[PDB]
Design a protein around this ligand. Structure first.
Ligand SMILES: *[C@@H]1O[C@H](CO)[C@@H](O)[C@H](O)[C@H]1NC(C)=O
Lengths: 51, 50
């Protein structure tokens, strides 16, 4: 890589539902909905590297 | 580098950093006296520079 970026959920400054979405993004690593939906959308073709 | 890779290569203990050279490419700056310890109990970890 070159940096260590990450994408964040866009919320207004002083969001009313910040913690409603903050610990909601904390819980998506628990069962892994970030990870169990990672295999689908990034892997459109199972590219067979041999070289 | 340390700004650009903050919390990426930064260990918080010596022996975990000893482990981190033992895993992958890692240089682990510390003082030579502790370097004199780990080198003389492991023939796998030497000291580039003086
Ligand atoms: C590094 O340490 C010893 C030599 O001091 C070596 O035998 C050992 O296998 C190495 N450890 C690894 C490759 O994890």
């Amino acid at each position: 890589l070159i940096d260590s970026k990450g994408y964040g959920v866009g919320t207004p400054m002083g969001s009313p539902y910040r913690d409603k979405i903050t610990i909601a993004i904390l819980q998506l690593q628990e069962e892994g909905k970030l990870h169990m939906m990672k295999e689908k959308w990034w892997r459109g073709n199972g590219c067979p590297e041999e070289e | 580098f340390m700004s650009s890779r903050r919390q990426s290569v930064l260990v918080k203990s010596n022996e975990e950093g000893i482990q981190r050279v033992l895993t992958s490419d890692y240089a682990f700056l510390m003082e030579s006296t502790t370097i004199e310890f780990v080198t003389q109990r492991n023939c796998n970890l030497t000291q580039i520079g003086g």
